[PDB]
């Protein structure tokens, strides 16, 4: 009792029903996978920038 092995028939129709949406891009993407020596300094840089802006517009 052999049967059909594999096909890709109807698959693109199924995809293009409500399919091929591009992913939503955002301002400020995720920083995971970025180098830890860069992120460790970036935290202190933004902390100092926020403190300077708070002291400027306090």
């Amino acid at each position: 009792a052999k049967s059909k092995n594999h096909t890709a028939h109807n698959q693109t129709r199924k995809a293009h029903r409500n399919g091929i949406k591009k992913p939503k891009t955002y301002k400020y993407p995720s920083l995971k996978g970025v180098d830890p020596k860069f992120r460790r300094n970036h935290k202190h840089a933004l902390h100092g920038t926020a403190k300077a802006l708070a002291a400027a517009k306090k």
Binding site: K14, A15, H16, N18, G19, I20, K21, P23, G33, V34
Partner: peptide, 14 residues
């Protein structure tokens, strides 16, 4: 490090 959009099934993955 490079970001590509790959079509997997019916959507693109990062």
């Amino acid at each position: 490090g490079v970001i590509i959009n790959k079509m997997v099934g019916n959507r693109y993955l990062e």
